[PDB]
Amino acid sequence: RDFAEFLEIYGLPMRVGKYPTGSTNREKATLMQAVMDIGRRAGGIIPMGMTLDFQSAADGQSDPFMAMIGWAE
Amino acid sequence: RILDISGQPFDFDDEMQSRSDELAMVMKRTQEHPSSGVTPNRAAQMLRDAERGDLTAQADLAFDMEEKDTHLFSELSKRRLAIQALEWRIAPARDASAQEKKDADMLNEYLHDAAWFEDALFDAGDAILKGYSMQEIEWGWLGKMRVPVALHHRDPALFCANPDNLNELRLRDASYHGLELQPFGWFMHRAKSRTGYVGTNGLVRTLIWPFIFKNYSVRDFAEFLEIYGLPMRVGKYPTGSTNREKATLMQAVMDIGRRAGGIIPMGMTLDFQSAADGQSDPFMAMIGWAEKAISKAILGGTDEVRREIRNADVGQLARSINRDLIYPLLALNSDSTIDINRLPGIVFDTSEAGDITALSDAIPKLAAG
Amino acid sequence: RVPVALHHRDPALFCANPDNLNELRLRDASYHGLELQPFGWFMHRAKSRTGYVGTNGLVRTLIWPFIFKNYSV
Amino acid sequence: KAISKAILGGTDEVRREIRNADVGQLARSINRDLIYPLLALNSDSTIDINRLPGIVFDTSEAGDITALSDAIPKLAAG
Amino acid sequence: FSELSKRRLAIQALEWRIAPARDASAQEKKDADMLNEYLHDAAWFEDALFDAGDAILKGYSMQEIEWGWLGKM
Numbered sequence: 271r272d273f274a275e276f277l278e279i280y281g282l283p284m285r286v287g288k289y290p291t292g293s294t295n296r297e298k299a300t301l302m303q304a305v306m307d308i309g310r311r312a313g314g315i316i317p318m319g320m321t322l323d324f325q326s327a328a329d330g331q332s333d334p335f336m337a338m339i340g341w342a343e
Numbered sequence: 344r345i346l347d348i349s350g351q352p353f354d355f356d357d358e359m360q361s362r363s364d365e366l367a368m369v370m371k372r373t374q375e376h377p378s379s380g381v382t383p384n385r386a387a388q389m390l391r392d393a394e395r396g397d398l399t400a401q402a403d404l405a406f407d408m409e410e411k412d413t414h415l416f417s418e419l420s421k422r423r424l425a426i427q428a429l430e431w432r433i434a435p436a437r438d439a440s441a442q443e444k445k446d447a448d449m450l451n452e453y454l455h456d457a458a459w460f461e462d463a464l465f466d467a468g469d470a471i472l473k474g475y476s477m478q479e480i481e482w483g484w485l486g487k488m489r490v491p492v493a494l495h496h497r498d499p500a501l502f503c504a505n506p507d508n509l510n511e512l513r514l515r516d517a518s519y520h521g522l523e524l525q526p527f528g529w530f531m532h533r534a535k536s537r538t539g540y541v542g543t544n545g546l547v548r549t550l551i552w553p554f555i556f557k558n559y560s561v562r563d564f565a566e567f568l569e570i571y572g573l574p575m576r577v578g579k580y581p582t583g584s585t586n587r588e589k590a591t592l593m594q595a596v597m598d599i600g601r602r603a604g605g606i607i608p609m610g611m612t613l614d615f616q617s618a619a620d621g622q623s624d625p626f627m628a629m630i631g632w633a634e635k636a637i638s639k640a641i642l643g644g645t646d647e648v649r650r651e652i653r654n655a656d657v658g659q660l661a662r663s664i665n666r667d668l669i670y671p672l673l674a675l676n677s678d679s680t681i682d683i684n685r686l687p688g689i690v691f692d693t694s695e696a697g698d699i700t701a702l703s704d705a706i707p708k709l710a711a712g
Numbered sequence: 713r714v715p716v717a718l719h720h721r722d723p724a725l726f727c728a729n730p731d732n733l734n735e736l737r738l739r740d741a742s743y744h745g746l747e748l749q750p751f752g753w754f755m756h757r758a759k760s761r762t763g764y765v766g767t768n769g770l771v772r773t774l775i776w777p778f779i780f781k782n783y784s785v
Numbered sequence: 786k787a788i789s790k791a792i793l794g795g796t797d798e799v800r801r802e803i804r805n806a807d808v809g810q811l812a813r814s815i816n817r818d819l820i821y822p823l824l825a826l827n828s829d830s831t832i833d834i835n836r837l838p839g840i841v842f843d844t845s846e847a848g849d850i851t852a853l854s855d856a857i858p859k860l861a862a863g
Numbered sequence: 864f865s866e867l868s869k870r871r872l873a874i875q876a877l878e879w880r881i882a883p884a885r886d887a888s889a890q891e892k893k894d895a896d897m898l899n900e901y902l903h904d905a906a907w908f909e910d911a912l913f914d915a916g917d918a919i920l921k922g923y924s925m926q927e928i929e930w931g932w933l934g935k936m
Contacts, residue, residue, distance in 0.1 A: 274556055277629055281567045281621030308618055311573040313596040315589055318579055324616055332625035339632065409761065410772040413787040420760065421794055424802040437900070456835060458813060462759075469762045485835065496762060535910075536868065538917045549864045565780055639865045651872040662906060684904060684933065699855045706858050713826035715819075751822045756814040758807060770791065777787045 273335035276328060283324040290319045345527070346680055348670055353526055355675070357482045360514065360525040361497070369515060372498060378407035381558075386551050396504035398474070398542050403500060405473055405547045408554050414634050415554065418641040423468045425653055426660075427461075430692040433669075436685050447687040450672065459493050463530065466496045467660060470534040473499050474545035475512060478530040482675075489675035491668075494530060509540040527671045532663040534656060549640050557633035564626035567619060574615040581610045650695075657691050664689050718754060733764040801846075808842050815840050871916045875909075 287305050289298060304314065305322075316322055344352040361370055377389065377400055386404070393401035409416055433451035435443045454460050463478060470476040477499065483492035502512045503521050512531065513521025524531070535544045578596050580589060595605065596613075607613055638645045643652060665688045674681050726736045727745050736755065737745025748755070759768045789796045794803060816839045825832050881899035883891045902908050911926060918924040 273629065274559070277560055277563065277625055280563075280625060282570075282619055285618070308575060309570050312575045312618065313577075313593065313599075314575070315578045315580060315593050315596065318582055322577065322616070324618060326620070332628045336628055336632070406763075410767075411776065413773050413777060413791045416761070416773045417790045417794060421799060421802075424799070424806055428802050428805060436904075458817075461809065461813070465759065466762050535913065537864070538914050561780070565783070568784055643865060643869055648869060648872070651876050654876060655872055658909070662909070666906075700852055703855050703858055706862060709862060714823070751826070754814075754818045756811060756818070758810055773791050774788060777791070781788075 273332065273339075276330070276335075277332075279328045283326040286323055286325065288321040288323075345674055347526060348666070348683070350683075355527055356525065359479055359481065360522070360528055361479065366514075366516065366522075369501065369517065372500065374406070374498075374500075375403055376407055377404050378411060381555050383555070386555065390548060390551070393542050394540075396506055396509070396542070398503055399500040401542070401545075401547055402473060402498070404551070405545070408547070408550065409472055411558065412554050412637075414557075414637055415550065415641070418638060419472055422471060422641060422652070423465070425649065426468060426656055427465060429653070429657060431661075431689055432692070433687055434690050435687045439685075443685065443687070446673065450669070450687060453490070457490075459491065463494045464660070466494070467530070467532040467663070469496075469499075470532050470545075471536075471656065472546050472550075474542045474547075475499060475502070475531065475533045477502060477512070480528050480530060482528075490672070504541055512541065527675070530663075530667045532660060532667070534659055546640065550637060553633040553636045553640070557630055557637075560626050560629040560633070564623065564630075567621070567626075568623075570619045574617040577614055577616065579612040579614075654693055657693060661689050661691060728765055736765065805844055808844060812840050812842060867920055870919060871913070874916060875913060 285305050285308055287301050289301055293301075301320070308314075345355045346352050360366065377385070389400040389404060409419060433447050433454065435447035439447070466478055467476050477497045479495040479497060481492040481495070482489060484490075501515050503515045505511045505513050505520065507520070513523060516522050533541060533544070536546060537544050537548075576596050576599055578592050580592055584592075592611070599605075635645045642649065665686075669688065670681065670686060673686065725739050727739045729735045729737050729744065731744070737747060740746050757765060757768070760770060761768050761772075786796045793800065816837075820839065821832065821837060824837065881895050881902065883895035887895070914926055915924050
């Protein structure tokens with residue numbers, strides 16, 4: 271079950287967006303929608319004040335889970 | 344009045360129980376698909392409900408699994424073709440009389456001459472995955488003999504177990520107690536893979552989890568493959584850019600492919616960031632583990648065990664046939680009471696094929712004595 | 713009386729009777745299709761899986777691997 | 786490999802079983818659809834329902850003539 | 864479950880026969896063979912044996928008995 275949970279959140283880094291403190295409430299909504307619209311071969315234009323980065327939320331291999339499963343079996 | 348196998352007299356009606364006008368409403372059903380968005384809590388709730396006597400959601404889930412999963416369908420088809428390939432013959436009881444032998448051979452000839460027998464056996468094989476298999480009986484006349492014209496398969500979702508007494512199926516009629524099965528009008532075959540009450544002896548209980556894991560892993564793998572090996576293209580523009588200038592940059596970013604060129608001003612920047620990374624090893628490892636688990640569950644190995652499985656389920660099917668189809672034919676055809684302990688049965692050709700090369704050793708034994 | 717020849721027909725021109733499944737009918741833009749003319753058709757069905765007609769074919773299990781393979785390639 | 790497993794059963798005995806099953810189904814379909822109408826139209830009298838001919842396919846494994854030489858001792862013994 | 868099913872199918876595949884005690888009399892042999900014939904003629908024996916195999920995983924197996932009459936027996 272832990273292996274399945276790890277596989278669920280694997281190989282898809284989280285997309286974050288940084289906005290200046292002077293941004294309007296509506297401007298945050300547009301950025302949030304734009305972050306949610308990333309897939310396949312995606313483009314996009316970002317202002318100089320804003321930044322976009324990808325951070326992986328899970329890393330590792332399947333060797334230990336499979337080793338334990340095989341030992342138990 | 345026709346005497347039941349248990350010895351309780353009853354009245355025989357040729358019309359089907361499902362042909363009643365009041366029962367016609369429940370016969371038409373919409374086959375829901377509970378395999379869309381499966382959740383472990385949802386599966387546990389479905390199994391718990393099926394334990395108490397629901398038997399509907401579990402049946403629909405099993406139907407969805409037998410078509411959505413390729414490996415499970417392949418293994419079930421292999422098992423059903425293995426059981427179907429055997430040969431059968433009707434034999435009477437030991438120390439049978441001449442009349443008993445005549446009845447046995449006439450029934451045997453009729454059943455080889457009956458076309459619906461093969462379809463009935465194939466449909467009765469559905470109790471390997473589902474906990475039960477229910478088929479109608481359409482009685483008719485053939486030379487003043489009461490024989491079934493044809494047998495019609497029925498949806499397993501239309502039956503519920505009696506809460507007062509489990510292990511007994513009943514026809515659902517939107518009531519606390521379902522309608523009792525009409526005697527001499529049904530062919531009920533159940534495969535007891537695991538001991539316990541009906542609705543828990545099927546292969547769904549153990550095969551629900553590997554199916555979920557394998558399907559979720561493969562769908563996540565496909566989604567990851569969709570957004571793989573193509574980094575996102577971004578463009579940075581100065582805060583003083585015109586509205587039209589942003590549109591041109593956005594169009595230029597969208598026009599990148601093959602061996603692309605382009606000129607960019609000093610104030611603008613262009614970069615590539617990968618939106619997905621990793622390998623396919625863990626997804627394939629999980630998929631392989633689930634597939635071999637399913638194969639072990641269905642076939643027993645990933646052979647002798649296959650032979651034992653065939654012998655067991657063939658014996659169960661033979662017992663079901665003897666209890667459901669053999670007795671009513673003799674009871675309806677014969678005017679006198681049918682002896683309970685002296686009726687013919689069905690025996691399948693469950694014998695290993697000999698090797699003619701190694702049986703040449705019998706000649707010295709025959710010479711010796 | 714012998715058949716001169718047999719002509720294959722498009723499977724898309726037939727519909728199952730809603731009142732009674734497992735029975736095919738010729739589509740005629742009506743709630744109930746025309747019943748098959750006796751001694752005029754040759755209907756062969758392969759029951760790979762038990763159930764009603766139109767669900768016993770190999771399409772039901774082969775639809776998904778085809779989609780995955782084609783999209784991947 | 787999933788498609789191959791679905792269609793053929795393996796990626797042989799299983800192929801033989803598949804052939805036997807679908808050949809039997811096709812034979813039943815032929816007997817129900819084509820054999821009966823020919824006799825019904827050609828013959829003036831009513832056609833017996835339980836006494837009509839059928840079609841049987843040659844579903845028999847080919848024997849090995851080398852290993853059947855063992856029948857001679859059995860024939861001699863009786 | 865697979866291992867338990869394999870073990871239960873292995874134990875179930877054996878063949879059984881009722882035999883009397885050593886140096887048995889004619890009446891003892893007759894009783895033994897009549898019981899043997901009855902138990903092969905009894906349908907519930909196979910189900911009883913299969914249910915008694917549940918004591919491999921569980922510590923015990925309990926089954927009811929419904930007594931009846933068959934030819935004043």
